[PDB]
């Protein structure tokens, strides 16, 4: 049984916590629910920590008083097919292996499944840790509650004695680095300085041994990623996002200065030894568009290369942790602004970007976003009860499972079948264009070896490589983006037609050059 | 937003609350969640209350941190048919009107429905307040969440200017009195002395004007009826039950001294002006058999008559608030011990008991009770979740709705259809014997007017009236008890055969006497 | 509300329509259900149209007396996937783009 | 939950079968290019020996009807072996074709 501590004692030194805790909806929630600070209080001074207090980061710390939200969060959607590879003819990107050759995603890239599994799936995917980590057996893949209790309760490490990244099975890669973990867990929130910069008070940083870092982490999607534990108010904690919105002053809605001011973010900084250490972004409103944008965005979280001279950009560089915060038509400019690309294509040699799940940036400017709709309206709606206290469902999943609450309350003119038919019209149309974009990209890629062996000039090949960058960008954005065009159907259509145009231009250029060499 | 108060200051005077609160699982829950004591603290001494602090009795006070339990509690079971009269050929007691003639239940006696409605249903039934209270319109009958928010949010009073019990419609009765409300709400828990005795510190007592009392009450089945708000530990608050178990020393299981010691109750008394005022019974274990027995028992909550001399026993008498705490075979002796009967039959003139829902006393000695099964195992089972934090369902309803959790976890040899078939075999057999018991009782009742008109002696009529008491007791117990035999099938069988035996004896007696008068 | 016209007037010039209309199952269906020919009748000659009569081509012109057939016709089968491209691996022609290159499809 | 466990295995194994086929097809398509570039029989026979293994460690799993469920660890090891052999063959042939071009 918990015994309360006297918070007044803590508040003498922790004035920012005092201002947040005493005013918010957790004013009555005693520190002992999440902190064991007995030895800390005995040894601390106003500027020196003394013994470090223990802080609970497990989701059960919140489930004690918020069981409904916790239980809704941990539910596993069995209809979300697990470990389903995107590079197959029946999934999102039938020609993915040809198009992505040269990148670590060639080793494995599956469709997402329920949030409970995010940390374990990160640890076990073939592209991340060389196959070092596995579920204890193949039964554990179902255990959402187990994963939530902790990754290391359901996983095993092939070699606890070494901490280097290496391959344990031949067709794996070692793409994981510490920045990845910021979108899988915030168990490290007190051990990681803003952006993962080197810092005396940080145990972990961008340059840490990621296998050692991994072993220290346990819980997926901590509740406090969106809710400040002290004020209970809405926030983000993701450094990349705070950096884009606040430090670079781009705003929460970069296309809408008025909405950015009404639905803004305030950066709050915490210090260690009176030096800035970590930060959070307090939200003006409970805006799920910004909360989900902590992870559902295009980012850099990896080493890469400079566009200018081709030199390596390593994890030590700030660009290795970067939110572009740009939609598809602004992305090339944003990548040029930091002088960065992700990989060279194995066949064409083109410098190329690597795009990942840009849901937040795609949603901007769409009909729903312009009408004030947010991610939670469709993916975490309020529960409808004939008799009961309403709460917000935290089972973040497709609106197909709850169309009444997600769509039909707003769209009263439609039955569920009509709303599903509208979704399918958009996804079917967009998927047809993604398949055509891949066809043309693959046709261009296949000409590069023919051109090289025909003696086509480097000048012509470099022209085709510049077109490859654009053809790739305007295609990959849409295979990476999870709604298959629904979040912004007009933009998908315009982008995919641009991809095909660039590929066709490249095919024409190479065919002419090959034919001139033949004559 | 709530602001915490200094609980240590309260404890300078409230030592019993200190002992409970600081030790239990609510040690971190601040008083401000349930008490507004600002002016109280400014004016109180250890010997004088000063300003009375406000105490919240609404269920939302607990739902803030225990939403899952509250939502399961308030759910309305639409399959529990509402306002369904038991005195109809298709319900529990087809001949009820003939058999109960002379009692207030002849005006209306419906089947129970969901707990959310218990207080509103008490106020609107035709037997209780002369038809004074109604739902605001006939649509409100569905509004469980509204009833829980408060009775007077969904009901109207035909005459807010008068406080007397009277008929507003011809075929109603005014049977309600303050004792009834103890099984419908505990909004009065700080305003009612133990047993409803007169007390200087009690606003309300057994002799209060029930219409005035009614207007002060709002919430059904408060959560603290089973859970102490200070320690969060299991308890009962119902004075009639604490009186039977503790004051009369009967024990929690009167047929099992060992179980009574292991699963016992400790009376805790609270004083006003240094005189005993109210009490609660803290339970050794979370024993739902005793928690549900606060209301699901046979009781006196009404005026009646003495068996010895027939004189009136009024609401002022302690016997007007009494738990017999006796099974069907011990009841007659238990009523003789307090010298009490309920009504005289309108046709036969017999002194008769009135029995009400004796589930707790029926359950004793049954195969399930003897095997350590309790009400909650069948009616409040733990929720089964593929992934989630388990909690106890508070939707207290038939196990037919949740057979996997209520029966089939224990009875692994059975399918759901087989378990339902076993229930129906018992209920069909029992209902058959109830109907035969009614047939024979009705036959006996119809002979009384014939015997009186034939000039049969009072001595013979009085022997038949004695038999009527027993025939009635051993039948009505089973129409009152809600499981239709399931809770104790062998006992139901023995009792109902006893009823039929007694009625047959009386029929023989009266037919012989009538025939002797004719000859 | 429709007002019937005298079809005998039309039949003087429209002998093929007469032979078809008077014999079939629409013999009792007046021309006004589908034609507004007031100014036409005033201006036509046996060989010159004069003012062109209006002819309704909307399906509601038939739905007035044949609601069952009309309602069955307009039902949308939501199970018939809309805008589903045939040139994809999960549809009718996985290699369609290669095979049809040069054509508008 | 049991169906979800089956599907995790079959989905993972099918993803590796598709990748094994991609790499086998990439190797097969280089053979005509190598032949017409004048690559030596010695190099082609090396690639043919690798084809035997790449084929075996792929085809076993398209032939086997459980899509990996009957032995998921073995499927995984075999399919990764298939891809390794194909990649070795692709590298061998691409180098040889490029040497003929130079
Ligand atoms: C002054 C004597 C202090 C009192 C009293 C308390 N804390 Fe403290 N704490 C203090 C310092 C100087 C630091 C280092 C950070 C800084 O602000 O300079 C801390 C740190 C914490 C932390 C962070 C621990 C980590 O892992 O980084 C927590 C969670 C914390 N303190 C909590 C806390 C609580 C609950 C207290 C009351 C019981 C409390 N502190 C007292 C200084 C002082
Ligand atoms: C019980 C001791 C609690 C623990 C542990 C946590 N929370 Fe809480 N929370 C609690 C109360 C009594 C309230 C007020 C409810 C009300 O409506 O008055 C809250 C409120 C929240 C809210 C709503 C805040 C708002 O501004 O609307 C959120 C988002 C919330 N709490 C989240 C939360 C999280 C993430 C926790 C774990 C770190 C957590 N709470 C612990 C009671 C308790
Ligand atoms: C980083 C900490 C994240 C935040 C904040 C949110 N999401 Fe997420 N999401 C994330 C990952 C890593 C995954 C895949 C997990 C895996 O193990 O595969 C997801 C998945 C989803 C899904 C798919 C769920 C399914 O049933 O397949 C949806 C619909 C989703 N995410 C939506 C979503 C919304 C609406 C958010 C804000 C409320 C949100 N996510 C936050 C990472 C993170
Ligand atoms: C009893 C006769 C069994 C039947 C029928 C099935 N399973 Fe099983 N399974 C069984 C045992 C004793 C074990 C090993 C358990 C352990 O923890 O040591 C298993 C294992 C599995 C696994 C994990 C396999 C792995 O390689 O790690 C899965 C995914 C599994 N079982 C699923 C499963 C399904 C879907 C079945 C019906 C088709 C099934 N099992 C049958 C025992 C028995
Ligand atoms: C936040 C900006 C993220 C960073 C940094 C990383 N990932 Fe991620 N990941 C993220 C989201 C929002 C989702 C779900 C949506 C989706 O498109 O899949 C994911 C998903 C995964 C998955 C599951 C699906 C899969 O690709 O197999 C894995 C295995 C995964 N992510 C691994 C991973 C690695 C190894 C990272 C660093 C190189 C990494 N992620 C970064 C959000 C974020
Ligand atoms: C961001 C991706 C979230 C994570 C992680 C968690 N919650 Fe949440 N929560 C989120 C949103 C968008 C909302 C609704 C805000 C609105 O006003 O529309 C909520 C709401 C809550 C509340 C308030 C009560 C309610 O509306 O249900 C509570 C108590 C709350 N959330 C708790 C909670 C817990 C315990 C979590 C970890 C399991 C959790 N949230 C995660 C967004 C996010
Ligand atoms: C309703 C108007 C929506 C808003 C606002 C957002 N999304 Fe969405 N999303 C929507 C649909 C109809 C779909 C397709 C679902 C289907 O079953 O066909 C999606 C898809 C996603 C996914 C993939 C989910 C899955 O495949 O299981 C993710 C990860 C997702 N959406 C995330 C997301 C985020 C982060 C949003 C705010 C920026 C967002 N969505 C808004 C409907 C709606
Ligand atoms: C949040 C501010 C709370 C309010 C208001 C109430 N309760 Fe509570 N309760 C709370 C916590 C944090 C815990 C402990 C959870 C744990 O398992 O550690 C509890 C516990 C209970 C229990 C369980 C007690 C036990 O001994 O097992 C019960 C039965 C309980 N609470 C009931 C309850 C009732 C009836 C309330 C209204 C009067 C109520 N609680 C308020 C948090 C909060
Ligand atoms: C719109 C044309 C209506 C149709 C069709 C039905 N109802 Fe109705 N009902 C309607 C109104 C405007 C009112 C009065 C509302 C008010 O608050 O003043 C009602 C009333 C009822 C009631 C209460 C009756 C009473 O005597 O108090 C009930 C129980 C009710 N309605 C139910 C009901 C059912 C079951 C219907 C389908 C058979 C139905 N109504 C049709 C408006 C309309
Ligand atoms: C606790 C010992 C009780 C006292 C005192 C009163 N009632 Fe009751 N009542 C009780 C239970 C456990 C039930 C449900 C089981 C059942 O057999 O019905 C009830 C039910 C009612 C109902 C609804 C059913 C009906 O009979 O119409 C009403 C209207 C009701 N009770 C009214 C009532 C009145 C007027 C009382 C004082 C004379 C009274 N009850 C006392 C438990 C208890
Ligand atoms: C007696 C008729 C009860 C009333 C009224 C309420 N609850 Fe209850 N509760 C009851 C039992 C028999 C149990 C389980 C005890 C056991 O250990 O088996 C519970 C349990 C709780 C808990 C504990 C967590 C859990 O097991 O779910 C909580 C937090 C709790 N109950 C809360 C609660 C609230 C908020 C109520 C009013 C809506 C409430 N209970 C009423 C019995 C009774
Ligand atoms: C399982 C072994 C049970 C235990 C222990 C208790 N009861 Fe029960 N009850 C049980 C059944 C199978 C039935 C019949 C349900 C049906 O749908 O046929 C009942 C009935 C009730 C009822 C009437 C419920 C209704 O008709 O909707 C009440 C009010 C009831 N039981 C209360 C009750 C109490 C208070 C108990 C502990 C003393 C108790 N029951 C034990 C199964 C079981
Ligand atoms: C002779 C004086 C006519 C009378 C009386 C009517 N119509 Fe006629 N119509 C007439 C001519 C010479 C033509 C041109 C075609 C031809 O047969 O030479 C027409 C044309 C029509 C059409 C076709 C209009 C079109 O868009 O092409 C219709 C639908 C038509 N006429 C109908 C019609 C009706 C309903 C009349 C009676 C009310 C009628 N016509 C009288 C000649 C004459
Ligand atoms: C009402 C004024 C009508 C309008 C307008 C139309 N039709 Fe009709 N149709 C009508 C009647 C009274 C009948 C006879 C029904 C019978 O069975 O006796 C018909 C018949 C048809 C048929 C059946 C013809 C056959 O030979 O079996 C068809 C195919 C038909 N009608 C079609 C039709 C169309 C396409 C119309 C719009 C241009 C239309 N009718 C108008 C009454 C009326
Ligand atoms: O209150 S915090 O800034 O220590
Ligand atoms: O690899 S994560 O970004 O999907
Ligand atoms: O603590 S109480 O008994 O005043
Ligand atoms: O002050 S008390 O002890 O009467
Ligand atoms: O009247 S109550 O006891 O059913
Ligand atoms: O009748 S038609 O030919 O004008
Ligand atoms: Ca990227
Ligand atoms: Ca009684």
UniProtKB/Swiss-Prot annotation, chain C:
This is Cytochrome c-552. Heme 2 binds at residues 31, 34-35. The chain holds residues 33 to 137 of 553 of the full protein. Heme 3 binds at residues 26, 62, 65-66. It is found in: Periplasm. Homohexamer. Dimer of trimers. Catalyzes the reduction of nitrite to ammonia, consuming six electrons in the process. Has very low activity toward hydroxylamine. Has even lower activity toward sulfite. Sulfite reductase activity is maximal at neutral pH. Belongs to the cytochrome c-552 family. Heme 1 binds at residues 10, 13-14, 40. Besides, it may lower the pKa of the Tyr hydroxyl group.
